[PDB]
Each structure stands twice: as C-alpha cells, then as structure tokens.
Amino acid sequence: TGCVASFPEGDVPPGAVECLPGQVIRTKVNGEDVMLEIDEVDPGYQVCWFKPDVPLPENAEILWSYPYEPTAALPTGTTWEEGQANVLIPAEPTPEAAVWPPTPVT
Amino acid sequence: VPLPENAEILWSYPYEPTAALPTGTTWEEGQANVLIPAEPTPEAAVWPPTPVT
C-alpha cells in the first residue's frame, strides 16, 4: 500500500519509512511476488515509503505507487511501465563451444 | 470492510487520508429528506376593543 518516493536529503517527514541500502521489500510487481534489495542510493537523495496517511513533501518524485484496494484480500501491487523502471536482463553471452583441434591427414 | 449484497449506501465519505480536517459528506437534494419544523406563528393575542357609541 501507499507509494515509494525519492526526495533530497535532510529532514525526514514524520511517518515515512526510510529505505536505506540493504533494505529488503516484499512486493508484487505485475503479478509477480518479488523481493527488492536496495543498493547504492544516489547521494543528496533518499528513498522512503509513504503510506497514504503521510503527506508527501515538496520536490518529491514518486518512483512507484500502489492502487487503492482496501476490500481486496490479495493485493495487485504495482505496474512498472516502460520508462518507469529500467530493468536489465543479464546478457549472458554464450562463448564459443570448445572444439578439439582436428589433426590433418595428407 | 467489504459490503454485502443488496446493500444501500445511505451516505458515504470521500478518500482523504492526508487531510487533517476532514470534509465529511454532502447530502444532495434527494439523498436525504431534511424537515425544518413549520413553527406556525399563531394569531397575536389581541385585547377586545370595547365599543363606544
């Protein structure tokens, strides 16, 4: 529930849950139950979970948000659109298959 | 809380979690029949004037 927001460093809004490097977050993303581990938050900025009860500060950027579904038992989570999040699949370049040298025969 | 079947919302509130002072409701004409008491002011008690010929 709520939203995750990036905002410049300084005073924390009362009610916001800080998300420091090493923070693990169980969520649902496009129907997929996932764990997000925070790694290398940029300088001069910090990330926090803002419940709907908590007002957002100025100059805040909603990285991703959740819908309002209080009656729902199984929440839907989020929907990271193309451009909202840059997901990188590892290339995994399959190297050349190790071939044994054929000896020549005249 | 999920609502049951055959339920009739008499009046509802908006979603305002960040709000400190809530707005409450807005009973539209036809949503609620509010009755003001008529309070019919009766005739002012007049003293009978006696006649003089």
Added chain:
Amino acid sequence: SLAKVWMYASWIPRGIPKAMANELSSAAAALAHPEAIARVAQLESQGKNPYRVARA
C-alpha cells in the same frame, strides 16, 4: 564557571542510567517494526503521546 561546576558535579549522577537508556533505545530501533516506529514519529508530529495511545 558555575555551569561547568554543575556539569562536573552532576556527571556521575547523570551518567549511571545512561547506558541502559541508550541500550533500550537502540534495541527498540533494531527490534521494533519500522512501521511502528514511523507511527510513533507520526503521532509525535501530531503532538500526541504514542505510549498513551498504545495503552489505550
């Protein structure tokens, strides 16, 4: 000065329970759920005593 005299006189009284206080504060920051800690901060911004709220 007199402030320094009072400081150096009250150091040993004031510092006897400081260890347990910091221990409890840190253990609370560690073991307590961060949603609960955020709610405490929220109520403190709302001017309320969250301990009284919790008991109530």
